[model samples]
Target: MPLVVVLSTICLVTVGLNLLVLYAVRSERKLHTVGNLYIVSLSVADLIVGAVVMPMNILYLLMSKWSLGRPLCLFWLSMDYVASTASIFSVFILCIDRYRSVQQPLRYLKYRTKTRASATILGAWFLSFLWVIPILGWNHRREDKCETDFYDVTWFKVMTAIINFYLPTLLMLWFYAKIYKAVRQHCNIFEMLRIDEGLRLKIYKDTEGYYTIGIGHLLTKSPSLNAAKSELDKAIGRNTNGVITKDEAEKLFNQDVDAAVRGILRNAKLKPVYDSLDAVRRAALINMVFQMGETGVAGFTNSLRMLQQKRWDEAAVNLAKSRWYNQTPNRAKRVITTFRTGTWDAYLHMNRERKAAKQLGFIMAAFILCWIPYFIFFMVIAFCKNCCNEHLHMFTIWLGYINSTLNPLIYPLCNENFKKTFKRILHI
Candidate 1:
């Protein structure tokens, strides 16, 4: 009875979470990106894993036979193969999709289209169809058992196992290595600014008594809490709400960073110089752009042209005497020194390094973690008779199904945008 309850919970949770992801992706305009199709395709697979494969498995577990009859059994087997294999295939493709984005950041986003996304997802499902041919055409089974092992089809058995589990997992690890290598060598001004911002969850008065909220973001000058909430909601891309999570604050910070970068990259005269600058120098420029606003920094084209000529010493001195530089010597010195030395070693006061590398790792890592154990146990029981019992066998299969339950969660956990989206969906 308890087994029934637990399995039902897994089934419902998997369906609910994936459905929510689909709803959020479709309903939100901001989420409609090139990589958006991958999440949608992946969620469809998980949804089927919950709605179709799981309930049938539940019936099989309770009955101790494929008592749903032979035709129904074949349909279940096809669905089971199609759903799970497509899931792994989608995950494997998703890794490559991420890799290309990381590797060619400038080109990938600019050149991306729905066609590539559509083609890749369609290809995965068609490839997953390979199992259907043999299963439907082949002969199989005892009076009560719905065993998949047909007459001397050992080749299909082993190959299907590899395709479903071994192959995708191995490929995911290789791509992850390339991704982490790229991201570590990449950059972040987000946390650098956050170090000075001093995170605050609730709305409060700033130094000038302006009403403000998270990461010292000034909402409104007036003291009314509702006024602050109004701007907070606008910044967060939502309607009004009373409660805000820490994750919500981080998403808002991320948005501010996006606006800062967009301002730099979108500017006419600055974009070329910003592109030419080294990573540390680029970060410093972005930091200044965040505080000074785009036009203000555009007015600093004198120093920008000098920096473009690699004249850092003169440019740093030029910036040191600026009117705004005197406004905040504490942070300005660190920014200028980084610009002078082309090194981020000066900003180590903030003890945090970028965790996006590890965060992306969790996305790929969970896919393997859930499926690896099930496949390993499968191989053990395949060749050895006494290695496991019926209950243990059922548990391993359920563990595989648990992957669907978890697929939607890793995004919300690691991605602030997705977390904020989920929170918005929940509050609505």
Candidate 2:
């Protein structure tokens, strides 16, 4: 009953409510555009599967007896396979359509308009004929025992798997790869980080709990012993106590900045990324070198490569995930955000269509994940016909069916127009 109930709920949500999508698309003048037409056609094509598969599956094996009585087994079987192919045929064109539209974007000038989409819709439906004809292969149906009686499972399953499952999925991966690549594509410093110096010559414990003096230089992490004290001597007046002359601190501070800058050029790995990087990008590296030195910065080989590739999304976030970023929060947060964006802006900037791409990207992910298992099970159907894993077979297929409902739910969830229509028509 749980299986039966689960299947029914899916059928109800996608089929019954899918009707709501079409009507809303039709009546809403605001939605009567070429863009809306794509979604509506998707709704229309899927609903064909919905209505056709509707009565067929419910006349299902009750899980009661291994055997059942149904001379109508042939009819039920045909409807199932046809709708399955038809829905894949339907969704395939839309993904292609979406890919091309996104690339060149709003240039309807040469897009050639509705006639193309209408014809594409026709061409997609035209694949329906082959599925309709060849689905004639049959299974050995027993009167007392219901079993998968595809006209012939081997050629049918292999052929459909090639076209419907693997081929479409490969195309989806190829098309979406660059969409994600395109989407991933993104400040200041010493005084603010060092804190508008109050008394530059006075040594004090900085955030890392070490004695430090003058313009953001770390005294403790410096190489050990009085041997490391040479610069301290030169800047602060030799063996003088903690305090140094303000003028001397000033020179060393400026010199320290130059030292890190020089360190940046000296580091072999960063020279290329740093050399070509924007002024803002250069500052973020300077922050790292200033805080941790060039040798430590060289440890970020992967980070530098990602930065070099200019893959904005990966490069920006990983810095936050690293040890150096979190251990010292106050300055690092400021630096990481700068390094992440490669720009000083306070918020992310992307084209508005980018938001839609991500949402659909999620939908595509869900579709691929959910859809993979069932087709493999179909191959299982081809091999071990009598002893197939019947318990999970339907369940796996239905999981993919959940992908159908995601379009209805997520589209409304993301976009305001259809959602309000959904609320308005359903009514409080």
Candidate 3:
């Protein structure tokens, strides 16, 4: 009696949760995006599992007989296979979508439209229906005994398992692994170039009222600027205008900034450590010299020693405790955090929390936890025929089904939008 009550409660909860997912998606306009469409299809598949499959299984458990007759039994079997297969395929499709989105984000947005999402959903259902077609003709019915016959076609069972389970699982694993690698590589490269080479495209007057352009290159003291101005006047065959246009100023500025950056790196005895550092950090150090002259940076002997020793945290702390930090608090804070964290974005801007990504991760983890045992049991049954006990087999089967009930909980529990929508629906 206790066992029956537990199974009955599980089946009820599964149905209730899936129904809530369908309702939340349908009623909430915010959930009408292309990504959520795949979720809607997944929820529908699980709903069928709970509404049709679980209840039927409960009946079988209670009666210990196939009293529903052969035709209903056949229909039950088909629905069971189709819904579960569709659910698995839906998850696989989601993995592919995520992989493409992360791998080529720009291209993903261009192609991942509503039409594609709808087509993928339909395709998942169609393939699932096709997988169960064998059961329509292969009758496991016997008139003498009322039993759900497990068809003794070993090859057919193997093919079905591969088609519905092994292939999708392997593909999802491969895609997610590649996605992780791609993200890690991208983060490393992006951090390296976050602070790019400074572009001095305009001429300006410095604090001392001297003409400066192109990466702090002083044009007022340079013979080249004077010569270039003289040549331009002669080429135009005009008298000394004593003025340079923005374009001419920009050209001269570019030349000076490039020379200055290269000269600083070469002469500072920093070439070794500079080259070892990533591009962004190198740029940061060079810009510091531009802001404060070589003599100025040299005064911080302790900071330089820490930097050379690769003591990043100490270097950052030393930097924060300097006059520069007092003079420019915001910029110093950003740079210090970047050095401490080794992430370029830490210096570029404030980090926003990723609630959606967190929610998705929780869902994926729950799915893996719920389904992996079933697959493991499946392998054991395939290779060692007598190793799977009846009780354990039934437990694994229900455990896989439990994921459908858990999915709706996973979404709303972590997301504010879904939680509010769910609350509104339930009048809570």
Which residue pairs show backbone clashes in model 2? 67-144, 67-145, 68-144, 137-151, 138-151
Per-residue lDDT of 109-218 in model 1, one digit per residue for the tens?
Answer: 43467878788889989998787787767443442235664524545656767867787777788888887666453335656666655667777765666875666566
Estimated TM-score for each candidate? 0.61, 0.56, 0.60
lDDT of 3 by residue, 24-49 (tens): 88777887867677788889988998
Better by lDDT, candidate 3 or 2: 3
**Please, what is the whole-model Cα lDDT of each candidate in the order they appear?**
0.75, 0.65, 0.67
List the pairs of residues colliding in candidate 3.
214-253
Worst 10 residues of 2 by lDDT: 137-146
List, in order, the clash count of every candidate structure: 0, 5, 1
Q: List where candidate 1 sits over 4 angstroms from the true fold.
A: 108-111, 139-145, 149-153, 185-359
C-alpha lDDT (0 to 100) for residue 378 of candidate 1: 58
Off by over 4 Å in 2: 2-6, 63-78, 110-112, 137-153, 186-350, 381-388
